[PDB]
Structures are given as C-alpha cells and as structure tokens.
Amino acid sequence: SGPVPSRARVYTDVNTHRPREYWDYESHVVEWGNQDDYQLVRKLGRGKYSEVFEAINITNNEKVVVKILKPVKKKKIKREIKILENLRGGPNIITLADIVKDPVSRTPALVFEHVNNTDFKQLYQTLTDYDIRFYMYEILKALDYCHSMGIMHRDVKPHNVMIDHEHRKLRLIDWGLAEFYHPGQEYNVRVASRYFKGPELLVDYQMYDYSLDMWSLGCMLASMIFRKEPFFHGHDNYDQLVRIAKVLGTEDLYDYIDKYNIELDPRFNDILGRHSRKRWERFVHSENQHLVSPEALDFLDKLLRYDHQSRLTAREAMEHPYFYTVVKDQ
Ligand SMILES: O=S(=O)(NCCCCCNCc1ccc(-c2ccccc2)c(Cl)c1)c1cccc2cnccc12
C-alpha cells in the first residue's frame, strides 16, 4: 500500500470549526469595484502571473498598488481573494483594498495598500544581526497568524517579503499560491520556488501542512546569516533534493522516506548517494560571522528538518532564544 497519512501538529481543525463559506472559496462571489477610480502611474515589476503598478485612487488621491492578473482559472483568483479577505487586518499581512476589472480586457486587478519597500541592492549591505532577528520575528507573526487562520502561504521567500526599513515595517505579500489546510487533504506539490521547496514537495508527499512554510523560512534564514543566496542551489527539482542531502545528510532523508512509506522516484536512487550531515560551521567565515550565533544555528537546525512534523511551529519559533532581545523590546 501507499504513503502514511499526516496531520498538522497545530491548528489542525481550525477550518472544520469555521462556517463552510470561510474556506469554500469556489462559492465566493466577487464584488467588482470601478476601474475608473484608479489611474496607473508606473510599472513596479512583473511576475509569473501578474504585472504590478503604482497607481492613484482619484476619489481620494491615495497611492495604491495594482496587481493586474495574467489569465488564471476563476477558482484560483477566488481563492486568493478569499484568503486576503480572511487575513485582512492580521499582523504584517498585505491589505487588499479593492478588486476591479478592465471591461474591455476582462482582466481582473487586485488593489493593495501602498508599502514603501526599500532598495533591494542597498539594504542588504547594512543588515545587522539585530535587524535579521527583528525582521524574522515580524515574518513569524504573519505566519503564526495565517496558520492560526487555517492558511498555508506556500511561497515564502525574499521576493514575497516587503520591508519598509525606515518604518521598521514588514508585509507578507503574494498570497496567490496559498491554500486552506484541511486534515487529510492531498495538496499539489508543484508549488514554491525551486530553492525554497520543502523535502515533502521534492519527494511528492502530498499530505503536507503549515510546516512547509517553516522549511522555506529556514532557507531564507540560512541565506541571510551565511550570506549565501540561494542556500540550496539546485539545477532542477531532483538536484534540489541532492543539494539538501549534501547538507542535512542522506541517513535522515531515507529515515523520513521510510517513516512515511514514501515511494521514491527511481531517478533519485542514482543521484542522492551517501552524504554525512554537515556541521553549520562550514558556512561561517570572517564576512558573515557577525550574523552567526549559537542561537541562530540552533534555531536554523530546528527549521531545516526533512520530517515536516519535527520542524518548529511558528509559535515555537517565536519562543526561541534567538529572539529573546527582540521580545524584551516589545
Ligand atoms: O512587484 S512589487 O512592487 N515588488 C515586490 C516586493 C519586493 C521584494 C523585496 N524583498 C525584500 C526582502 C525581504 C526579506 C529580506 C530578509 C529580511 C530578514 C531576514 C531574511 C530576509 C530581505 Cl534581505 C529583503 C509588489 C508585488 C506585489 C504586491 C505589492 C504590494 N505593494 C507594493 C509592491 C508589491
């Protein structure tokens, strides 16, 4: 027979207890606002599934951001809208202001709150140890919130974290890949950027949960404290697991596969080989040492586990010694 089932350790049944309409996004009816309320100012960026503009709401002269969606199935747009509405007002979640349609293109556009996000090239050369702890804590507040609300982000990465450094403000954006957690549900593993994919995705284990986000977060943390972006630099999805195995070791990987009775693609049998679990010390050097602490390494170790069940929860992560200074401030 097949893979062993799995349940989230936390927030397992939060959706089952909510009215169906909370999570049953196929039933959601979108209220479209008026495109004529917004005038586009400049293009900010492009993504797989959208073009992003700065715009002005001419009703009230507010700066806003418009995300014009490339063609996607109605149900995927409904999912993102429902999730954004459910999460609206939660800590460090992007605020969806409005939803409009071009009545000639028929293209849908999401309208967001404007966040003054800070030069990408620039700020990186200045991140102190404190800054990294602080912003990691801010991301964890967003993740604990969305997890507690029954939602997996499933695409946590630097591109999806806006920082307004002047205001010490952070927002988690791009909820287009997020999904509701239901115990027993088999999810699509073809999510997330290669470098941030959890082992569960790479081995095709479908019964995953919130803990996916914690792997992605660990990848981010490693890249920041070690000044190595990306940390796990695979050539493709197969090689991505090999890069992980060269760090975490193959013994624990095969233990995970055994525990869940996962059927490993035969492609992997050739290429995984045999690798020791490496000490984190091999990534420390004179340039990055100011970012690296016993605390940082202990925390990182507890995010980056093959076994999704063994990873810290968001709320556990927030209680780690890595954050004691930040917590004492607030
Ligand atoms: O296309 S966009 O204009 N631009 C996407 C945002 C840029 C992402 C920049 N990443 C910053 C970042 C993050 C974390 C980090 C970092 C910090 C601490 C620890 C580890 C890593 C570090 Cl070091 C850097 C856009 C797209 C969609 C919605 C938008 C809504 N309102 C404005 C812009 C929007």
From Swiss-Prot:
Superkingdom per UniProt: Eukaryota
Catalytic activity: L-seryl-[protein] + ATP = O-phospho-L-seryl-[protein] + ADP + H(+); L-threonyl-[protein] + ATP = O-phospho-L-threonyl-[protein] + ADP + H(+)
Catalytic site: D155
Protein kinase domain segment(s): 38-323
Repeat in keyword set: no
Main location: nucleus
Compartments in which it is found: Nucleus
Record GO biological process: apoptotic process; chaperone-mediated protein folding; DNA damage response; double-strand break repair; negative regulation of apoptotic signaling pathway; negative regulation of double-strand break repair via homologous recombination; negative regulation of proteasomal ubiquitin-dependent protein catabolic process; negative regulation of signal transduction by p53 class mediator
Post-translational modification note: Phosphorylation does not directly affect casein kinase 2 activity, but may contribute to its regulation by forming binding sites for interacting proteins and/or targeting it to different compartments.
Keywords: Apoptosis, ATP-binding, Biological rhythms, Cell cycle, Disease variant, Intellectual disability, Kinase, Nucleotide-binding, Nucleus, Phosphoprotein, Serine/threonine-protein kinase, Transcription, Transcription regulation, Transferase, Wnt signaling pathway
Regulation of catalytic or functional activity: Constitutively active protein kinase whose activity is not directly affected by phosphorylation. Seems to be regulated by level of expression and localization.
GO annotation, cellular component aspect: cytosol; nucleoplasm; nucleus; plasma membrane; PML body; protein kinase CK2 complex; Sin3-type complex
Chain intervals for the UniProt region annotation (Interaction with beta subunit): 35-40
Subunit structure: Heterotetramer composed of two catalytic subunits (alpha chain and/or alpha' chain) and two regulatory subunits (beta chains). The tetramer can exist as a combination of 2 alpha/2 beta, 2 alpha'/2 beta or 1 alpha/1 alpha'/2 beta subunits. Also part of a CK2-SPT16-SSRP1 complex composed of SSRP1, SUPT16H, CSNK2A1, CSNK2A2 and CSNK2B, which forms following UV irradiation. Interacts with RNPS1. Interacts with SNAI1. Interacts with PML (isoform PML-12). Interacts with CCAR2. Interacts with HIRIP3.
Membership in a protein family: Belongs to the protein kinase superfamily. Ser/Thr protein kinase family. CK2 subfamily.
Extra remark: Can use both ATP and GTP as phosphoryl donors. Phosphorylation by casein kinase 2 has been estimated to represent up to one quarter of the eukaryotic phosphoproteome. Casein kinase 2 has been found to be increased at protein level and up-regulated at the level of enzyme activity in the majority of cancers. However, elevated levels of casein kinase 2 are present in certain normal organs such as brain and testes.
Record protein name field: Casein kinase II subunit alpha
The organism of origin for this protein: Homo sapiens (Human)
Span covered, complete protein: 2 to 331 of 391
